Design a protein around this ligand. Structure first.
Ligand SMILES: C=C1/C(=C\C=C2/CCC[C@]3(C)[C@@H]([C@H](C)CCCC(C)(C)O)CC[C@@H]23)C[C@@H](O)C[C@@H]1O
Lengths: 11, 239
């Protein structure tokens, strides 16, 4: 897991 | 007729698309430059794809209902659909004149040979070109195009989805909007079995997705190729 960039872009 | 809710949904998706797809392709200058003298088109095309992931996410965020999903499910959905929506949205630049993606200038005009200069083979490229033609042939209205992208993103059957009932309900509202739009606003003969032909494209995209993922895995196992990718591409597609 761990999608820090994807999670940032999502909000 | 189109209900007011269905008219709203279309309005939002049009705007969301206009806000994430720049038809002058102005930002392409910021990419590592294309080289057609190896994998010489990999830097340019990785940057193009990376930029496009960010835009697809921006579009996704504005899909009615998308924000009622958990952040986990938002992630699963974007991760599995990103390549597919990039393929779909790229139809806008695709041209049947020379089977190429024409982004406003010879530098930013991509053909079969440029894609293979990014480490992909005909096993992916030929069905991708075929996909682009069949899709262009549908002559979709902008309203249908943006609706198709949103339905592709909100698919309940993607591996890892937790609240599949909710994903299906969000999608149903989009599917129903699309079907009603076709019947009320798309005049025959163009409208002939148009919905089922759009849904079939979603099937085709699953195959393209699987093949892209296979070659991506092979391309990126090599650390010298991986070095040429972006951090976002590595996070979204893998490794
Ligand atoms: C992107 C967009 C455009 C073209 C897409 C293309 C043409 C070049 C090759 C691409 C990028 C395919 C490649 C198989 C993907 C390779 C990616 C990687 C090297 C990381 O495995 C998928 C869609 C194709 C231009 C414009 O329509 C914006 C859109 O957004």
């Amino acid at each position: 897991k761990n999608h820090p960039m994807l999670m940032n872009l999502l909000k | 007729k189109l209900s007011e809710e269905q008219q709203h949904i279309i309005a939002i998706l049009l705007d969301a698309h206009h806000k994430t797809y720049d038809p002058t392709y102005a930002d392409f200058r910021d990419f590592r430059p294309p080289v057609r003298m190896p994998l010489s088109m990999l830097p340019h095309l990785a940057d193009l794809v990376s930029y496009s992931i960010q835009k697809v996410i921006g579009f996704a965020k504005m899909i009615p209902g998308f924000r009622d999903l958990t952040s986990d499910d938002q992630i699963v959905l974007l991760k599995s659909s990103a390549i597919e929506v990039i393929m779909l949205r790229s139809n806008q630049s695709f041209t049947m004149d020379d089977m190429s993606w024409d982004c406003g200038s010879q530098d930013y005009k991509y053909d079969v040979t440029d894609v293979s200069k990014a480490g992909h083979t005909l096993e992916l490229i030929e069905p991708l070109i075929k996909f682009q033609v069949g899709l262009k042939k549908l002559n979709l209205h902008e309203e249908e195009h943006v609706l198709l992208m949103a339905i592709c993103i909100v698919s309940p059957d993607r591996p890892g989805v937790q609240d599949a009932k909710l994903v299906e309900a969000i999608q149903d509202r989009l599917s129903n909007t699309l079907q009603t739009y076709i019947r009320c606003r798309h005049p025959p003969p163009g409208s002939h079995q148009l919905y089922a032909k759009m849904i079939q494209k979603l099937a085709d995209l699953r195959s393209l997705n699987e093949e892209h993922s296979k070659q991506y895995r092979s391309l990126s196992f090599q650390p010298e190729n991986s070095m040429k990718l972006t951090p976002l591409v590595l996070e979204v597609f893998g490794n």
